[PDB]
Amino acid sequence: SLGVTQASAQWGVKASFQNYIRGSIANGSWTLNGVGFDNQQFQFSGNSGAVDAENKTGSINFPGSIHFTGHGGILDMQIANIEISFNGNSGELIADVVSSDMDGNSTNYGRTVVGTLNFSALNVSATEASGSASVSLSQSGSQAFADFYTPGTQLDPISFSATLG
Numbered sequence: 001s002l003g004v005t006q007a008s009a010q011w012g013v014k015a016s017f018q019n020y021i022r023g024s025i026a027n028g029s030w031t032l033n034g035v036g037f038d039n040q041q042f043q044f045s046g047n048s049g050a051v052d053a054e055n056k057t058g059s060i061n062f063p064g065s066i067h068f069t070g071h072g073g074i075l076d077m078q079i080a081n082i083e084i085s086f087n088g089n090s091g092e093l094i095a096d097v098v099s100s101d102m103d104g105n106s107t108n109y110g111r112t113v114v115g116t117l118n119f120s121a122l123n124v125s126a127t128e129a130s131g132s133a134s135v136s137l138s139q140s141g142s143q144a145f146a147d148f149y150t151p152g153t154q155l156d157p158i159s160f161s162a163t164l165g
């Protein structure tokens, strides 16, 4: 097995969700704690995780949170501590999620699979790993989005790169 030296990931959650949050219906915004933003993608930076190159499995862990708000605080969605887990060319996007429904009632979903990953590219070597995957929304993710997206909806794709040591 190989440890992650430096990893980075790029994921916008969903472009149409960003535009909704910042648009004239939600009249909302987001705040970031330990996460950046560029190219309409949240920017994650991590130095932990491990990759079993022999078996092409791994987990790439990131700190940081995104906090979406809208509708005078009725919409309140937190996504934190994302993790890209892979086994072969499939995997899971895991995060800690707390979100509210349209009544403003919050649910702590805990640490949950937000989507299943299907990698279009996944490369692993002695010194690096990188990949890009489509993200298919999970049951818990659909509930966290207040049922506005159905399970299986395609979110933004996620990409990552990591040095390994």
Ligand code: HEM
Pocket: 014, 015, 016, 017, 020, 025, 071, 074, 075, 076, 077, 099, 100, 101, 102, 144, 145, 146, 148, 149
């Ligand atoms: C008073 C509360 C709310 C109202 C009136 C409301 C209303 C709406 C409306 C009218 C749309 C369509 C927007 C468009 O197509 O441009 C929409 C989309 C959406 N809403 Fe809200 N909503 C509320 C709360 C919430 C909450 C609590 C969530 C939880 C995350 C949420 C998640 C979404 C999502 C995911 C979409 C789809 C955005 C997209 O097009 O990608 N909404 N909502």
